[PDB]
């Protein structure tokens, strides 16, 4: 369970995502039911960016003991967006100023 999921999370990452999340629910080999989160990198969970960036899927894997849920979450890099906003609304970036060499008593040029 850990190997399988952990691999998936790492391959997604190696494919250049911003973040990824895997959840397995239901029973493995023990009578009682548990659930596990597997997550790496960056994700946002709320607002319109959700509809934009993260991609979700659930699959029911049917086994001899019972059935497990598989939930997957992939957060795409908004910098590569190519159709849409290229950043989260959160992103506020200040262009960097440039060192000046002031004074220089005025004169003038001619053309």
């Amino acid at each position: 369970i850990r190997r399988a999921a952990y691999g998936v999370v790492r391959y997604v990452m190696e494919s250049g995502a911003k973040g990824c999340e895997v959840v397995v629910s239901g029973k493995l080999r023990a009578a009682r039911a548990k659930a596990m989160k597997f997550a790496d990198g960056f994700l946002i969970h709320s607002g319109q960016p959700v509809n934009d960036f993260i991609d979700t899927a659930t699959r029911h894997v049917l086994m001899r003991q019972g059935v497990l849920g598989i939930k997957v979450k992939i957060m795409r890099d908004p910098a590569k967006s190519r159709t849409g906003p290229k950043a989260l609304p959160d992103a506020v970036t200040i262009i960097e100023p440039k060192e000046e060499e002031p004074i220089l008593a005025p004169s003038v040029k001619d053309y």
């Binding site: 691999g7 999370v9 790492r10 391959y11």
Partner: protein, 47 residues
């Protein structure tokens, strides 16, 4: 570690697939070809 190694072989299969390497006669019309006769017999209705 074996998760990683898994992901590394998934990159092997993925990067290797970036390059890597008729029975005629048409049964629809074969019944129309075999449509030739002498396939049955019909006679009846006495009294």
């Amino acid at each position: 570690k074996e998760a990683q190694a898994d992901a590394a072989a998934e990159i092997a299969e993925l990067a290797a697939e970036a390059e890597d390497a008729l029975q005629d006669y048409l049964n629809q019309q074969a019944n129309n070809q075999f449509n030739k006769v002498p396939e049955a017999k019909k006679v009846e209705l006495d009294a």
